[PDB]
Design a protein around this ligand. Structure first.
Ligand SMILES: Nc1ncnc2c1c(Br)cn2[C@@H]1O[C@H](CSCC[C@H](N)C(=O)O)[C@@H](O)[C@H]1O
Length: 324
């Protein structure tokens, strides 16, 4: 059995690839994953980049040559580290660039038949759609979580939002919960592959768990109440599900935040006597800045919304009713 092997820069088990190298979709294949993996390890380690500084992706010999060259360079670096040279700092977070490649790699090794994710009932709250790496990167940059925070993706799909946030932030725990069998099944493999690849690159992530469950269940009422940052792609959920979610958000703590693809209260909410029980009485809503040149299917640019629990809105309304 012909095989390509890439040694780990930190001495984990080598990544092994069968030949012929498989294709993942029209734009991704294992041959270019190998090449980009070498490239990224070269970014992690300058001396390796230096040692690397005629790739026919369809020729075995030629790809084996690339692999052996990387593998020989990894051995020499490992020897440098037994000398006076300081070994790669371990347990750091991956850069944004590396993380994107890791998630791509993890997805392609896990989501073995992507078409199966489109076998949901259409026009139902089970409609599946993936939030892009770039949006999640923006949210990470703009929300700024600390180790006091708990992060939950409600309806986590195959789990890639949770993996990215877990790789990038120091929340005490990250959760995803997903109800449908197909994506939750894939989420099990995403999880294993993410832990494997992260050890392989020698990078740390914060604690996370991917769960099969229904986030409208009784168990999930208290969990939502105690969550400080909720991510929820509720674009296709519909009004009954969003209403139920509103009822659960009303128990969140001051300063709790929800990032969503459809707003849970209007942006122009003015508290008055008719709307006293509406969820807009206890939260600020703002529209996150669109990322430059990102059109949605509607033609307008992709739109996400940040909600912050803030009951001073309601307290101020009540004091107002005492003072003309
Ligand atoms: N009550 C529930 N309990 C659990 N999951 C649920 C629901 C409901 Br209603 C819908 N969903 C799940 O929400 C996911 C929305 S796509 C966003 C994926 C990822 N977050 C992304 O943003 O890329 C889809 O897998 C539905 O099964």
């Amino acid at each position: 059995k012909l095989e390509l092997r890439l040694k780990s820069p930190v001495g984990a088990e080598p990544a092994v690839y069968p030949w012929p190298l498989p294709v993942y979709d029209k734009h991704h294949d294992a041959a270019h994953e190998i090449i980009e993996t070498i490239r990224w390890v070269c970014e992690e380690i300058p001396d390796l980049k230096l040692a690397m500084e005629d790739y026919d992706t369809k020729s075995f010999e030629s790809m084996q040559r690339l692999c052996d060259k990387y593998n020989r360079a990894i051995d020499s670096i490992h020897q440098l580290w037994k000398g006076t040279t300081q070994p790669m700092k371990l347990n750091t977070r991956p850069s944004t660039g590396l993380l994107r490649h890791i998630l791509q790699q993890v997805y392609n090794h896990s989501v073995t038949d992507p078409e199966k994710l489109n076998n949901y009932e259409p026009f139902s709250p089970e409609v599946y759609g993936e939030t892009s790496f770039d949006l999640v990167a923006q949210m990470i940059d703009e929300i700024k979580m600390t180790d006091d925070d708990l992060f939950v993706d409600l309806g986590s799909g195959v789990g890639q939002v949770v993996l990215q946030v877990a790789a990038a932030t120091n929340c005490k725990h990250h959760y995803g919960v997903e109800k449908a069998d197909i994506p939750a099944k894939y989420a099990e493999t995403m999880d294993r592959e993410f832990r494997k690849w992260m050890k392989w690159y020698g990078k740390k992530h914060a604690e996370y768990t991917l769960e099969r469950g229904d986030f409208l269940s009784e168990e999930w009422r208290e969990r939502i109440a105690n969550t400080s940052v909720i991510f929820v792609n509720n674009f296709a959920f519909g009004p009954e599900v969003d209403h139920q979610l509103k009822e659960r958000f009303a128990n969140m703590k001051e300063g709790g935040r929800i990032v969503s693809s459809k707003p849970f209260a209007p942006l122009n909410f003015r508290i008055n006597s008719r709307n006293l029980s509406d969820i807009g009485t206890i939260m600020r809503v703002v529209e996150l800045s669109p990322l430059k040149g990102s059109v949605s299917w509607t033609g307008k640019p992709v739109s996400y919304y940040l909600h912050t629990i803030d009951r001073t809105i309601l307290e101020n309304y009540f004091s107002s009713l005492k003072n003309p």
